[PDB]
Amino acid sequence: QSKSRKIAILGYRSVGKSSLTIQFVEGQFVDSYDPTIENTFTKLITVNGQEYHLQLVDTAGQDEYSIFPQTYSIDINGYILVYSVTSIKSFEVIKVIHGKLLDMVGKVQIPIMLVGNKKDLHMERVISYEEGKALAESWNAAFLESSAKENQTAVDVFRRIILEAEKLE
Ligand SMILES: Nc1nc2c(ncn2[C@@H]2O[C@H](COP(=O)(O)OP(=O)(O)O)[C@@H](O)[C@H]2O)c(=O)[nH]1
Ligand SMILES: [Mg+2]
Incomplete structure (x- = not known):
């Protein structure tokens, strides 16, 4: 009576893909x-x-x-696209990644969740909550900001993509 799902975490380098995932999986904020x-x-x-x-x-x-590896589109039930709120570059790149993803899968109307990570670095923020939310709305995707250092935000992210998947289901 269990349900297995495969989720791919995408994003520009250093936005926190590993740290967010690991915070969720092991409940710890790894340093290295x-x-x-x-x-x-x-x-x-x-x-x-x-x-x-x-x-x-x-x-x-x-x-x-980047040329999306086959592993990015086979048996994936949902995608988490993350950028850093401290990097305009990672934000512009996540838009391109989303476009490439749609090109690779087609019109499957895949479950997508946009995530603006590193929200704890208040001083270094350059992308606003509104800009992130506007992008997600452009895609009709779920949206959340997070911090690999705050476990509850990491848990909310993964719980959210699961619901998005079930919704599109
Ligand atoms: N302050 C802060 N640093 C973060 C956060 N997420 C990741 N980092 C730091 O950013 C760097 C890159 O993170 P990493 O997970 O390797 O990025 P990835 O390449 O996207 O997987 C590391 O030095 C992390 O400690 C976050 O939410 N807040
Ligand atoms: Mg990594």
């Missing part, structure tokens, strides 16, 4: 972590009384020139 390796974490979570077996694909990250 290999900058390039693509790894698939496993996580068990019960949402709405429903148990889920999650496979979280923490990708190596991509940019305007």
Whole structure:
């Protein structure tokens, strides 16, 4: 009576893909972590009384020139696209990543969740909550800001993509 889902985490380098995922999976804010390796974490979570077996694909990250690997579109039930609120570059790149993703999958009307990470770095913020929300609305995607240092924000992100998936289902 369990349900397995595979979620791919995408985004520009250093926006916090690994840190967010690991904060969710192990409940800890890791300080150091290999900058390039693509790894698939496993996580068990019960949402709405429903148990889920999650496979979280923490990708190596991509940019305007990346050529999406097949592993980005096979058996993926949902995608989390993250950018850093401290980087306009990561924000402009997440738009390109979204476009490439739609090109690679087609019109599958895939479940997508946009995430503006690093919200704790108040001083270095350059992307507003409104800009992030406007983008998500442009895509009709879920939206949330987060901080790999605040476990509850990381949990909300993953719970949210699960609901988006169920909704599009
Ligand atoms: N302050 C702060 N630093 C973060 C956050 N998320 C990631 N980082 C830091 O940003 C750097 C890159 O994070 P990492 O997860 O490796 O990025 P990735 O390449 O997107 O997976 C590391 O030095 C992290 O400690 C966050 O929410 N807040
Ligand atoms: Mg990483």
